[PDB]
């Protein structure tokens, strides 16, 4: 399991599936997070909360809570002209 709590502040993922009781998606997704959109991680607190991060151009913080139950994944690809 790869959540959105496994990346490091400085990385790029993007989120694919979104775990959850449903309700939890929901909420999620009301915010701006979605499958699809990429999520820049800004800052992620030494206690594991608040993670913040910048999508869909805001900038807020994420509850580990669902940032543990999110899936996305660490997209590396290299840069070229």
Not at 17 to 32: Q, S, V
Not at 61 to 81: D, F, G, N, T
């Amino acid at each position: 399991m790869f959540s959105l709590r496994d990346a490091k502040c400085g990385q790029t993922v993007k989120v694919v599936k979104l775990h959850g009781t449903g309700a939890l998606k929901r909420r999620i997704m009301d915010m701006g997070i979605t499958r699809g959109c990429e999520i820049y991680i800004r800052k992620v607190a030494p206690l594991g909360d608040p993670i913040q991060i910048n999508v869909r151009g805001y900038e807020l913080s994420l509850r580990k809570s669902a940032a543990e139950m999110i899936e996305v994944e660490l997209e590396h690809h290299h840069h070229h002209h």
